Symmetry: D2
Subunit: 166 residues, 4 copies
């Protein structure tokens, strides 16, 4: 079912270990806020927060498509004012959702707003949103694992692999 392993568990964990310090050094009297959209990046944000050597807090959101604009099924539980926000994504490509999210959050008057992603694809050029932190640059091929799914499966994989068309 998994054709090939794009990134092993140890490779992923070593990269996040690097990201943690890089993020930590930049944000080094309130805690850094990690904001994640359910649920492709829960494994990533749980590892990333532990990798960040400065105190960090969690906030989750749940959105849905309308069928560039998304429906909010679950909003933030806290006001964002004067807080350093770090949006945490799993995969960014033709992601207009991220574009919408950055605008929706900056309207709430954060003190800062950056974006960190584990995976970036070549089609992320067509998105209007800056990304300060990128784990890996991968091809456009459909990958699953480490939070990434295909019909809600393969999320529990600890590595990132490529699907065979089945």
């Amino acid at each position: 079912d998994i054709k090939s392993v794009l990134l092993t568990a140890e490779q992923i964990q070593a990269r996040i270990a690097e990201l943690g310090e890089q993020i930590g050094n930049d944000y080094r009297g309130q805690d850094l806020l990690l904001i994640t959209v359910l649920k492709g990046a829960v494994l990533f944000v749980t590892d990333l927060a532990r990798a960040i050597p400065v105190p960090t807090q969690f906030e989750f959101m749940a959105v849905s498509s309308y069928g560039g604009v998304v429906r909010i099924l679950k909003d933030l539980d806290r006001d964002i004012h004067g807080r350093d926000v770090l949006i945490v994504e799993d995969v960014v490509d033709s992601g207009l959702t991220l574009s919408w999210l950055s605008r929706n959050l900056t309207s709430r008057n954060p003190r800062s707003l950056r974006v960190c992603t584990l995976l970036r694809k070549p089609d992320a050029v067509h998105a209007n949103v800056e990304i300060a932190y990128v784990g890996f640059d991968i091809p456009n091929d459909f990958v699953v694992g480490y939070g990434l799914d295909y019909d809600e499966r393969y999320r529990d994989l600890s590595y990132i692999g490529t699907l065979d068309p089945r």
Copy 2:
């Protein structure tokens, strides 16, 4: 110096979760196992647990606030005929757990069990059956590894007791 004593090291937690996964994996062998977690104390635990379980598992989240209790974000899929494992972080009063268990059973899943990381002594009063317990601990307010005090100390890798000054 916010933490007085350390209760459970990162090694103890990791080693325990590896055992649970094995135990859970052996008990669940014929769809996929369904892990349901209520936001957001048991997010770190459920991300580490799923990876420890040697059978295919899926994630499902439910955000909920108190008034018995209010639903802010229901499940993203019907759980009819599914083997459901409720994943909690800490149980003592267990009033919310008791409701959640009843609310899920009324959706008629094939199987329903509960797995918690910590269990405090006051959990003997609540009439909820728990199939898997990571650790039994005294009746002290602990923090770390998902657990919070005013949204802080969740990103800690270990579990400790909070100093009286805080």
Copy 3:
């Protein structure tokens, strides 16, 4: 697109003023719980038709597959432990979105539960108390009811034609 009208404003509003009478007799304040949004137009006129002090509690609902599972989008703002609860619905077919709610509300343990519809249909699983109109298994739109979103603002209820 209404082929013909069988129920109009004067006929509906009068019955709704008659429904409130029965409710006033049979019934601190009364809670009207309604599912958005095909029955919103009916509740609003019902509360004013009831002499005793009533109240509103709204509840948004989506769905999964079909056969009677229900996803919750909003749900009540308050608890209803031991209180006057009257479910207000718009249409009742062989659909069990109604008692899923009553079961969902019974579990919260109110004092009294009672349902109430404007228009019932030849299909019936719960204690349906106060029935407004008994209509055949035909098309129904108007007065809150809809077909893809529209025909809600109508003061009457007409029949669509396929």
Copy 4:
């Protein structure tokens, strides 16, 4: 304990404003979308829509607080390329309405204005209001959709204390 606006005054005004909006929205196959916030203005919407001749469109939203507010219930449909009328119960001090504006125009509607029933005097805030039903004074008032600790909504008239 007081009477500000009679049920006759309220019902007569709504009909006259339904006339105001009925002939100002008359090219597009879409309808006028009535977007409102629970749970105060929910009685106005039912009477306002029937007062408006052109086919209209109900849409609701639930909002909590922390003008910073939180969405508990969102819109079912996207309002892109749509004529939207925001209907509010009472407009006073809260930047709740200004937020709803800056939030809905980001959905890029074809047109966006607001129709409120009552109007407090300090509602000179943000985004000016297209249509007004009654210019009320600066006093806490209930009745007709308005409430105090969840009540007096069943009233068909508007009265103080």
